[PDB]
Amino acid sequence: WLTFYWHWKHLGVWSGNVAQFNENSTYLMGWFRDYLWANSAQLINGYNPYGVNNLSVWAWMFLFGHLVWATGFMFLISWRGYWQELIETIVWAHERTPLANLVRWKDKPVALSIVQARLVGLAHFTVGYVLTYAAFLIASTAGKFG
Amino acid sequence: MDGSYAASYLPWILIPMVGWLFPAVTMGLLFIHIESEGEG
Amino acid sequence: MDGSYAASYLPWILIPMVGWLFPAVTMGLLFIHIESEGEG
Amino acid sequence: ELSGQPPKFGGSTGGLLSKANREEKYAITWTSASEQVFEMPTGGAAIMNEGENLLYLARKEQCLALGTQLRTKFKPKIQDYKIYRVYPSGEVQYLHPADGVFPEKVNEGREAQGTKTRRIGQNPEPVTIKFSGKAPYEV
Amino acid sequence: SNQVVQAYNGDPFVGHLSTPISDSAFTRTFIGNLPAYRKGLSPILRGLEVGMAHGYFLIGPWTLLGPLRDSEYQYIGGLIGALALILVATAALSSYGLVTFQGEQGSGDTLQTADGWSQFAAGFFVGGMGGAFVAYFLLENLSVVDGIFRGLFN
Amino acid sequence: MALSDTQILAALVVALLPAFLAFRLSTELYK
Amino acid sequence: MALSDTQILAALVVALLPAFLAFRLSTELYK
Amino acid sequence: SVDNNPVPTSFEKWGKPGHFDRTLARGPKTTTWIWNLHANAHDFDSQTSDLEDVSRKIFSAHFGHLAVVFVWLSGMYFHGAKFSNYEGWLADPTHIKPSAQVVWPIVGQGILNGDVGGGFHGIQITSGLFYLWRASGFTDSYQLYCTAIGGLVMAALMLFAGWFHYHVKAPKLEWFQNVESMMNHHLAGLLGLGSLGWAGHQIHVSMPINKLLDAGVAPKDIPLPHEFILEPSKMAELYPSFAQGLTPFFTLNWGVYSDFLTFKGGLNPVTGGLWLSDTAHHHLAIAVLFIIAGHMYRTNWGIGHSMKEILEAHKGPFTGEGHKGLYEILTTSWHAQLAINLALLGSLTIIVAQHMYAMPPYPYQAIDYATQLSLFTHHMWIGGFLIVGAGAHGAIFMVRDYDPAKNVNNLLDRMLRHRDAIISHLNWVCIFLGFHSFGLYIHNDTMRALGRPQDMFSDTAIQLQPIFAQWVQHLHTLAPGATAPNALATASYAFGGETIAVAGKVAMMPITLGTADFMVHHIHAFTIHVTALILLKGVLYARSSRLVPDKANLGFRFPCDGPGRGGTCQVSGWDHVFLGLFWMYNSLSIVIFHFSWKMQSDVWGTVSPDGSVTHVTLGNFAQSAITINGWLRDFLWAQAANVINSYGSALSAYGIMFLAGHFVFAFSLMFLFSGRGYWQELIESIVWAHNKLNVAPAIQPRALSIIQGRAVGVAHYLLGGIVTTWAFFLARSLSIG
Amino acid sequence: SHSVKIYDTCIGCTQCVRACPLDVLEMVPWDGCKAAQIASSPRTEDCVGCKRCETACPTDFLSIRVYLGAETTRSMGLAY
Ligand code: CLA
Ligand code: CLA
Ligand code: CLA
Ligand code: CLA
Ligand code: CLA
Numbered sequence A: 001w002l003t004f005y006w007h008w009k010h011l012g013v014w015s016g017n018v019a020q021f022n023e024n025s026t027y028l029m030g031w032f033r034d035y036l037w038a039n040s041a042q043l044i045n046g047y048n049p050y051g052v053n054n055l056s057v058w059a060w061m062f063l064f065g066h067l068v069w070a071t072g073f074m075f076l077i078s079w080r081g082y083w084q085e086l087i088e089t090i091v092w093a094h095e096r097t098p099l100a101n102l103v104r105w106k107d108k109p110v111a112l113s114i115v116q117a118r119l120v121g122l123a124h125f126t127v128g129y130v131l132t133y134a135a136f137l138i139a140s141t142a143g144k145f146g
Numbered sequence B, C: 001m002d003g004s005y006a007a008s009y010l011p012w013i014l015i016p017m018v019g020w021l022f023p024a025v026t027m028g029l030l031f032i033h034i035e036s037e038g039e040g
Numbered sequence D: 001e002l003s004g005q006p007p008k009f010g011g012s013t014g015g016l017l018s019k020a021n022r023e024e025k026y027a028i029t030w031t032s033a034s035e036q037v038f039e040m041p042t043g044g045a046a047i048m049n050e051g052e053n054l055l056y057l058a059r060k061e062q063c064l065a066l067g068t069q070l071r072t073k074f075k076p077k078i079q080d081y082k083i084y085r086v087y088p089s090g091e092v093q094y095l096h097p098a099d100g101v102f103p104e105k106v107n108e109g110r111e112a113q114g115t116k117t118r119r120i121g122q123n124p125e126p127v128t129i130k131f132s133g134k135a136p137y138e139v
Numbered sequence E: 001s002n003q004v005v006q007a008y009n010g011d012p013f014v015g016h017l018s019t020p021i022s023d024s025a026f027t028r029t030f031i032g033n034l035p036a037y038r039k040g041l042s043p044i045l046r047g048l049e050v051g052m053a054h055g056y057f058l059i060g061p062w063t064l065l066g067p068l069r070d071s072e073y074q075y076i077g078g079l080i081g082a083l084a085l086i087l088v089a090t091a092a093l094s095s096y097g098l099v100t101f102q103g104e105q106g107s108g109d110t111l112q113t114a115d116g117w118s119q120f121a122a123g124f125f126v127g128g129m130g131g132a133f134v135a136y137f138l139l140e141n142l143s144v145v146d147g148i149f150r151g152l153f154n
Numbered sequence F, G: 001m002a003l004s005d006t007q008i009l010a011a012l013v014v015a016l017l018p019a020f021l022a023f024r025l026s027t028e029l030y031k
Numbered sequence H: 001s002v003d004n005n006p007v008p009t010s011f012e013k014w015g016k017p018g019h020f021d022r023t024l025a026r027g028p029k030t031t032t033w034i035w036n037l038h039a040n041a042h043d044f045d046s047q048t049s050d051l052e053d054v055s056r057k058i059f060s061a062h063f064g065h066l067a068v069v070f071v072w073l074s075g076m077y078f079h080g081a082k083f084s085n086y087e088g089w090l091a092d093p094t095h096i097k098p099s100a101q102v103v104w105p106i107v108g109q110g111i112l113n114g115d116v117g118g119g120f121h122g123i124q125i126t127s128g129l130f131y132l133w134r135a136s137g138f139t140d141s142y143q144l145y146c147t148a149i150g151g152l153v154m155a156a157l158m159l160f161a162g163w164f165h166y167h168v169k170a171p172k173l174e175w176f177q178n179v180e181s182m183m184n185h186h187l188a189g190l191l192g193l194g195s196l197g198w199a200g201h202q203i204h205v206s207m208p209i210n211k212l213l214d215a216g217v218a219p220k221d222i223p224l225p226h227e228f229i230l231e232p233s234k235m236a237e238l239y240p241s242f243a244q245g246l247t248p249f250f251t252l253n254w255g256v257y258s259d260f261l262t263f264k265g266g267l268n269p270v271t272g273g274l275w276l277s278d279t280a281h282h283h284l285a286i287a288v289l290f291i292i293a294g295h296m297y298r299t300n301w302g303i304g305h306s307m308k309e310i311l312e313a314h315k316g317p318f319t320g321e322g323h324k325g326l327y328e329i330l331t332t333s334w335h336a337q338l339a340i341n342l343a344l345l346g347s348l349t350i351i352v353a354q355h356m357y358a359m360p361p362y363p364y365q366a367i368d369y370a371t372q373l374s375l376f377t378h379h380m381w382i383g384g385f386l387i388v389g390a391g392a393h394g395a396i397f398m399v400r401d402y403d404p405a406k407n408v409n410n411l412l413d414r415m416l417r418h419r420d421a422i423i424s425h426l427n428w429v430c431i432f433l434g435f436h437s438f439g440l441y442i443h444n445d446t447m448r449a450l451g452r453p454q455d456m457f458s459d460t461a462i463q464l465q466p467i468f469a470q471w472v473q474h475l476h477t478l479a480p481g482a483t484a485p486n487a488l489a490t491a492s493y494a495f496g497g498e499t500i501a502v503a504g505k506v507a508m509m510p511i512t513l514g515t516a517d518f519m520v521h522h523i524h525a526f527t528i529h530v531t532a533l534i535l536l537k538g539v540l541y542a543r544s545s546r547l548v549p550d551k552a553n554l555g556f557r558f559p560c561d562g563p564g565r566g567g568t569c570q571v572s573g574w575d576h577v578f579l580g581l582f583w584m585y586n587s588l589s590i591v592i593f594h595f596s597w598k599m600q601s602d603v604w605g606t607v608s609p610d611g612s613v614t615h616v617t618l619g620n621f622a623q624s625a626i627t628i629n630g631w632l633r634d635f636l637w638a639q640a641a642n643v644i645n646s647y648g649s650a651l652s653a654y655g656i657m658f659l660a661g662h663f664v665f666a667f668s669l670m671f672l673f674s675g676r677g678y679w680q681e682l683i684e685s686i687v688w689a690h691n692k693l694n695v696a697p698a699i700q701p702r703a704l705s706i707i708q709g710r711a712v713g714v715a716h717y718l719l720g721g722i723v724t725t726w727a728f729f730l731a732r733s734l735s736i737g
Numbered sequence I: 001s002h003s004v005k006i007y008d009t010c011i012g013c014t015q016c017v018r019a020c021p022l023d024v025l026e027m028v029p030w031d032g033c034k035a036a037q038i039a040s041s042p043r044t045e046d047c048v049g050c051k052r053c054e055t056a057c058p059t060d061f062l063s064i065r066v067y068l069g070a071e072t073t074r075s076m077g078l079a080y
C-alpha cells in the first residue's frame, strides 16, 4: 500500500501530472486503472511477438514473481495429510517398478511438515511479492523516464 | 556473447564453472555428506 | 536403390531389420533357449 | 512360532512393502466361530477362516484398527486377538494386549509410567533449565 | 481358474498383484534377461549394455530439437549434449553407489554392493559415451550410411 | 492413384495387432 | 581508462587468499 | 403402499431451531451451534437412521426445489413481459439489444438504465431469453404474463405436492426401490414424451411465426398462435406437405413429411440459429428412441429385463465377480446415486455448453456475442460444480453407506484393492501433462524473452499440429454427401465450410486448430486430470490409507487426525472436495479464457460486403496465446480496458463487481491461510473487553471450526473469482459490438 | 519418540485409553481420585502424536499431555 502510494505520487510529480492523483486516488478504481493497469503497458511489452526491448528481463521477472506467489498459494491452502497420502502412492509406485527397484531412497519420502508447509508457502509468497513489485517498479519508471 | 573488457575469456570459462562445475561439485559433496552413516 | 512408392524410407530401414536384426535376435534367443539346462 | 490360517484374500496393492522384510511387520491372530467377511485396513474385503486367523500388516495401527473392528463390528465380539511385532531376524515380540487384559480395564502389576506427581500448571519455567538439554515436562 | 489377476508370489498380503503386466511369463523372461537383471552377468557388462543403449538414444533430442539444429553443427551439438548428460548421469550413479553401500555388503546380488555398483557405473560411462559417439558417427556420415543401404557405392 | 505414407504407417500399426495375437497363440500352443 | 588482463588475473590470485581463509573459518566453525 | 398422516402439521416446531438434530435441540451454548444448525439441515441420513423417512424427506425436498425453480421461471416471464422490451426487439432484432430488467432511479443508479434501443432504459440482459422465446414462437407480452401466472400456479402445485407427500400420504420404501419401472417411466415418460410434445409444439406453433418473421412479416400481422390450430389451411398454405393428413405416418411413407422434417444441417442464414425443421425432426427421432428405450426393464408384466441379472452377467478373467452387487448399492444408497447422477449431469451441462456455441439453436443468439459467452461460461461452471459434488457424494457413500461384507471380489472391492496403482498412475499422468503443456508455455515465454522466436513452439517455429483433430475436422467436412448422403450441410461450420454472416456480424466459421490450440487442449487435459486425481483419491481413500487406517470411523467431514504421523490435516474426503473445488475452478477459468480469446480472435467480428471479416482481436491468438505473457497482456490487460473504463456509464456496475470480486477473493485468503487457534485467542481478548462492561453474551462466541474456516475460504475464493470473471466477460462482450 | 505425560488431575475415566488408536496408554491402580485409577503411558515408542487422548480428556486443562519430539518410522506412521 505504501509503495503503491509513493510510486503513484512520484509518477504524478515527475511527469508533472499531479491532477491524476489528486482526482483519482480518492476512489479505488482510480488506483486500479490509472496506476496498476496503465503503468504495466510498457512492462508487459518487454517481449511480444514483434520483438524484445531492454525491459524483456523485467517482463519475465514480473511473470516469474506471479508464478512464485501462486506457487506459495499451494503450500498455504493445501495442507499436509493429502500430500502424505499422495506420496504414499508414489512410494508404492517406485517400489513396484522394475529397473527402478534397483534404486532405493536413503531417506524415506514424506510430505513437508505443517510448520514447513507454512514457512515454504510464505517464502514463495514473499519472493513472488518482492520480485513482482520490483519488476513493475523498475520497468514502469525506466520506460516512462529512464 | 562477447566483451570489450579486459580478459574476456574469463566469463567464457567462469560462467560454466560457476553455473555447472561449482554447483554439481557442491551438491555431490553435500549429498555424500548428508547421507554419511559414519557415527552420528 | 530408391522407390517412387509411398514411405520409401521404410524398405531402407526394414530390409536390414528383417535381414539382420530379426534373424540375429531370433537365433540368439533360440540358441539361449535350446541350451537351457533348466529342468528338462 | 506364530500359528493361524491366513484369511483368504485376492491380494491388494495396500499390503506389505519392503519395510516388512527390511525393518518390521506386525501380526494379528484371532479365533473366529464362523466364516464371515471383514474389511481390510489396507482397503478391500477379506474372509476370515473358522478357527485361528493370522494376518500380516505393515503398521501396529492397522492391526489395532482391525482389532477395534473385531471388537465392535461383529455380533459375537472377537475379544481374544493378539497383536505381535515381527522382525526380519525371526524374533516375534508380543504387543497387545500386553498383560492379557485390555488397557481400558485396570490390572494389578501394571506400573505407572509417564505419570507426573505435579499438575500441568506447575511445570517449571524453560529459563530455569537452559543449556540442560531437557524440556519442562521431562524434569 | 480363469482369473489372470493373482496374489504376487502367492502372498495376498504383500502390496503387489500378479498381473499380466507385472508377472506374466513374457514379463519375467524379458525383465529378468535385461542387463540389469540377467543372470550370471558381471556388473560391468550390465552397465556397458545399459550405457550403450542409453547413450545411443540420447543423441536424438538435441540433434533434432536443440539450439544447434539449424546450424551446420547440428550433429555436433547433439553429441555434446548427449556426452554431457551421460557425464552427469554417471556422476549421479557413482554418488548413489557411494551413498547406498556404505556399510556391510550383502551376499546376494553382486550388483547391490559398492564394488558391483562401481563396476556398473564404470560400464555405464563407457557404454554411454560409446553409444553417443557411434550414433553421432552414423549421423555425421549419414550420406554414406544411406548410400550403403541403397547400394549407391556398389 | 498411389497410396499415402500415412496409409502405409496405419497398416503397420494395424499389423501390430495380429503380431501380438500370434505371439499369444504361439505361447499358448507351446505349453 | 580500462584495466588490464594482468590486473584481473592478479585480483583473482589475491582472491585465492580469502577463499582459503573462508575454508579455514568454515571448517573451524563446523567442529 | 402409502402411509396415512405420518407427520402432523404444527407451527410450534418452527419456533425451536435445532429440532432435527438431537444435540442442537438442547439449546445454544457456543456460537458453533448456530453454525452447526445451517450445516446440519439437509443431512437427512444423519438425523434419522431409517431409509424410509430419509426417502420421504428427499421426495418432499425435491418438490420444494421444483417449486423454487418454478418461482424463478415465473419471475423471468413476468420480467420479460412487464419490465422488458420484447415488444420492439421482435419487430427489429438487429437494432435493439435484449433488455428485461428495469431499475428504479435512486441514489444515481438510474445510470445503469442504459439506452438499449427504441426509447428503452434498462440493463441489457445476456441470458438469451429473447432468442429462446422467438424460437418458441412467442409474440406478445400477454402470453408471457400467462406463462408467468402458470409458473406461479405450478410452483403452488409443487409446494402442495411436497406437503401432501410428507405430511398426509407418503410412500413406502419398495416404491422407491422399484427402479426398473422408474427408469422406464423416466425414459418413455419425461424425456421421450416431453420431446414428442415439444416436437409437436415446434411443428405446430414455433415454426409458423418464426418462418414468417424470417420472411419479413411484421409481428402484429402474424395473428396469434392458436388460430393456426383453429384452421389447418394455413399449414397447407405454408408447408404443402400438410395435405395428406396423418395417412403417410401410419402407412410407412414418411418421405411425404420431408418438407417440415428435414436433414439440412448448418444454420438458417437469416437468423444464425439452427433450422427449426431440423430441430423438430431431431426431437421426433429422440422421442421415438426414448420411447423404445423406456420399455427395457420388467415393471409389472413379466416382460423386460432385470438390471440385477444384466449386472451379474458381466464379469471377466480380469475383473473377478464383475458387477455383482451394484444393484443393491444403487437401490439402498441415495449418496451413490447422487454421485453418479451429479457426474453425468455435470458432464451433460458441459456437453451442452460445448454444443450450443458451435450449433446455435436460437435465432440471433450467435451474433449476440455477450449471450454466447455468458451461456457457455455459465453452463461450464454449473457442470464443473456438479462434477465436484459427484466426487463429494462418492466419498460420502464410501464413508457412510459402503459395506464390505456385501461387496466381495466385485468391481468396487478390486478398485479398493488396487487404488495405489490407480492413483500413482494418475499422479504420473498429471505430472507428465503439467510438464508437457505448461512447460511448453514456459519454454515459449523464455525463448521469446531471449529473442529466439525460431526456437518457440508455434506455427512459425517448431510446430505442434493437432493432426488428429484436423483429420476429424476434415472427415466432418467431407461427411455431408459421402458418409452422410442425406445430410445437406455439415453438422457445424466450425468443422469446416463457409462463414455465416447474419447482419454485419459473424455467427460461425471454420475454427482452425494450430499449435496454440494443441497447447491449450493439453492444458485442459492436464487440469481435468488433476481435478479427477484429487476427487478420485478422495473417493478411493475415504475409508482408509496407509497413513490413517481408520478414516471411515472419523467420518466424511473432519479436519484432521492431529499433528501426529508427521501431520494429517486435510485427509478427509471433504478436504479432497475442498481442494478439487479450487482445481476445478482453475480448469474452468482456463477453459472459458480459451473460449473467449479464440472466439474473439478467429471467429467473431464484422463482415465486409465483399466477404472479408475483420475480427474483434484481429487473429492474435495464433501468436500471443502461446506465451503466458501474451495471455497476460493481449487477453487480460487488453480486454480488461472495457471493464475498468466503465465508470460513469451504464456498464459501471460491471466495474463495481470487478472491484467487488477482487475484494472477496482476497478476503478468502484470510480464511485460507490462517488457523482458528489465533482467532480463538483474539476472541478471548475481545470477550475480556466485553466482560469489563458487562456486555458478555450468554451464547459464548467461538472461532469458526477448521472445516468451516476452510469452507468459508473456498466459498469466498470461488465467489470473488467468478464475480470478477463475470464482470470482465460481460463488460468486454457488451462492448465488442 | 513422542512424550506422553499424565498429571495428577486425572480422574480415571479411561477415555484417553479408549481413544488411543496405537495402544500407548493403560490404566493402573491409584488413590488420588474416586475412580482409584490413573492413566499411564508405557508404550510411547508406538505413539504417533495424534492427540486423540487429549481430545477425549474431560478435565479442564487436560490431565494427559502429548509433546511431539523425536520422529521415528513408528511416530511418523510410515507403512514403508
Ligand atoms: C560477492 C560479490 C560478487 C558478486 C555478486 C559477483 C557476481 C558475478 N561475477 Mg564476480 N568477482 C567478485 C565478486 C563478486 N562477483 C570478486 C571479488 C572478484 C575478484 C576480483 C570477481 C571476479 C570475477 C570474474 C573474473 C568474473 C566474475 C563474473 C561474475 C558474474 C558471474 C558469476 C561468476 O562467474 O563468478 C566468478 C567469480 C569469481 C571466479 C571470483 C570469486 C568471487 C568472490 C571472490 C567470491 C565471493 C563469495 C561470496 C561473498 C560468499 C557468500 C555467498 C553467499 C551465496 C553465501 C556475476 C555477475 C564473471 C563475469 O564477468 O561474467 C560476465 C567473470 O568472468 N567475477
Ligand atoms: C506374409 C506375407 C508377406 C510377404 C511374403 C512379404 C514380403 C516382403 N515385404 Mg511385406 N508386408 C506384409 C506381408 C508380407 N510381406 C504385410 C501384411 C504388411 C503390412 C501391411 C507388410 C508391410 C511391408 C513394408 C512396410 C515393407 C515390406 C517389405 C517386404 C519385402 C522385404 C521384407 C521386409 O522387410 O518385410 C517387412 C515387413 C513388415 C515390417 C510387416 C510384417 C509382415 C507381416 C505382417 C508378417 C507376416 C508373418 C508371416 C505370415 C508368418 C509366417 C512366416 C513363415 C516363415 C512361417 C518382402 C518382399 C519391405 C519392402 O517393400 O521392400 C522392398 C518394406 O519396407 N512389407
Ligand atoms: C538379406 C539381408 C542382407 C542385407 C540387407 C545385406 C546388406 C549388405 N551386405 Mg550382405 N550378405 C547377406 C545378407 C544381407 N546383406 C548374406 C545372407 C550373405 C552371405 C551368406 C552376405 C554376404 C555379404 C558379404 C560377403 C559382404 C556383404 C556386404 C554387405 C553391405 C554392402 C555395403 C557395405 O559396405 O555395408 C557396410 C555396412 C554394414 C556392414 C552394416 C551397417 C550397419 C550399421 C550402420 C552399423 C551398426 C550400427 C549400430 C552400432 C547398431 C544399431 C543398433 C540399433 C539401432 C539396431 C550391405 C549393407 C559387404 C559388407 O559387409 O561390407 C562392409 C560384404 O563384404 N554381404
Ligand atoms: C582433483 C581431483 C579430482 C579430479 C581431477 C576429478 C576428475 C573427475 N571425476 Mg572426480 N572426485 C574427486 C576428485 C577429483 N575428480 C573426489 C575427491 C571425489 C569424491 C567426492 C570424486 C567423485 C567423483 C564421482 C562420484 C565421479 C567423478 C567423476 C570424475 C570425472 C568426470 C569429470 C568431472 O568430475 O569434472 C572434472 C572435475 C574437476 C575439475 C574437479 C573435481 C573435484 C571434486 C572434489 C569432485 C566432486 C565430486 C563430484 C560429485 C563429481 C563431479 C561431477 C561432475 C558432473 C562435475 C573426472 C575425470 C565421474 C566419472 O566419470 O568417474 C569415472 C563420477 O562418476 N568423481
Ligand atoms: C444434486 C445436487 C446436490 C444434492 C442433492 C446435495 C445434497 C447434500 N450435500 Mg452436496 N454438493 C453438491 C450438490 C448437491 N448436494 C455440489 C454441487 C457440491 C460441490 C460444491 C457439493 C458439496 C458438498 C459438501 C462438501 C458437503 C455436501 C453435503 C450435502 C448434504 C447436506 C447438505 C447441507 O449441509 O445443506 C446445507 C448447506 C449449506 C449450509 C451451504 C450453504 C452455503 C453455500 C456454500 C453458499 C453458496 C453461495 C451462494 C450460491 C451465493 C451467495 C450469495 C450471497 C452473497 C448473498 C446433502 C446430502 C454435506 C454433508 O453433510 O454431506 C453428507 C457436505 O459436507 N455436499
Ligand code: CLA
Residues within 6 Å of the ligand: A067, A070, A071, A072, A073, A074, A075, A077, A078, H427, H428, H430, H431, H432, H433, H434, H435, H438, H439, H442, H530, H533, H534, H579, H582, H583
Ligand atoms: C501456479 C501455482 C501452482 C503450481 C505451479 C502448482 C504445481 C503443481 N500442483 Mg498445485 N496447487 C496450487 C498452485 C499451484 N500448483 C494451489 C493454489 C493449490 C491450492 C488448492 C494447489 C493444490 C494442489 C493439489 C491439491 C494438487 C496439486 C498438484 C500439483 C502438481 C501437478 C503436476 C504437475 O503439473 O507437475 C508438473 C509440474 C509443473 C507444471 C510445475 C512447473 C514446473 C516448471 C514449468 C519447470 C521448472 C524447470 C526446472 C525444474 C526449474 C529448476 C531450476 C533450477 C535452478 C533448480 C504440480 C507440482 C497435484 C499433484 O501433485 O498431482 C500430481 C495435486 O494433487 N496442487
Ligand SMILES: CCCCCCCCCCCCCCCC(=O)OC[C@H](COP(=O)(O)OC[C@@H](O)CO)OC(=O)CCCCCCCCCCCCCCC
Residues within 6 Å of the ligand: H314, H315, H316, H317, H318, H319, H320, H322, H323
Ligand atoms: C485419445 C484417444 C487415442 C489414444 C487412446 C489411448 C488408449 C490408452 C490405452 C488403452 C486403455 C485400455 C483400457 C481398456 C482395456 C480394458 O478395459 O480391459 C478390459 C479389462 C476387463 O476385462 P474383463 O473381461 O474382466 O471385463 C469384464 C467387464 O465386463 C468388467 O467385469 O479391464 C481391465 O483389465 C482393467 C484394467 C485397465 C487398465 C488400463 C487402464 C487404462 C488407463 C488408460 C486410460 C486411457 C484412456 C485414453 C483414451 C481416452
Ligand SMILES: CCCCCCCCCCCCCCCC(=O)OC[C@H](COP(=O)(O)OC[C@@H](O)CO)OC(=O)CCCCCCCCCCCCCCC
Residues within 6 Å of the ligand: H035, H036, H038, H039, H040, H557, H558, H581, H705, H706, H707, H708, H711, H712, H714, H715, H716, H718, H719, H722
Ligand atoms: C460461486 C458462488 C460461491 C459458491 C462457492 C461454494 C463452495 C461450496 C461449499 C460447500 C460446503 C458446504 C456444504 C456443507 C458442509 C459443511 O457443513 O460446512 C462446514 C460448516 C460446519 O462444518 P463442521 O465440520 O464445523 O460441522 C461440525 C458438524 O458436522 C457437527 O455438529 O458449515 C458451515 O460452514 C455452516 C455455515 C453455513 C452458513 C449459513 C449461512 C446461510 C447461507 C445460506 C444461503 C445459501 C445460498 C442459498 C441460495 C442463494
Ligand code: SF4
Residues within 6 Å of the ligand: A079, A114, H559, H560, H561, H562, H563, H564, H567, H568, H569, H570, H675, H706
Ligand atoms: S494444523 Fe490444524 S488441521 Fe492440521 S493437524 Fe493441526 S489441528 Fe489438524
Ligand code: SF4
Residues within 6 Å of the ligand: H564, I004, I019, I020, I021, I022, I023, I024, I025, I046, I047, I048, I049, I050, I051, I052, I053, I054, I066
Ligand atoms: S497422541 Fe495418539 S497415539 Fe499418542 S498416546 Fe495420544 S492417542 Fe495414543
Ligand SMILES: [Ca+2]
Residues within 6 Å of the ligand: E066, E067, E068, E069, E070, E071
Ligand atoms: Ca539455433
Ligand SMILES: [Cl-]
Residues within 6 Å of the ligand: A047, A048, A049, H448, H624, H627, H629, H630
Ligand atoms: Cl508474449
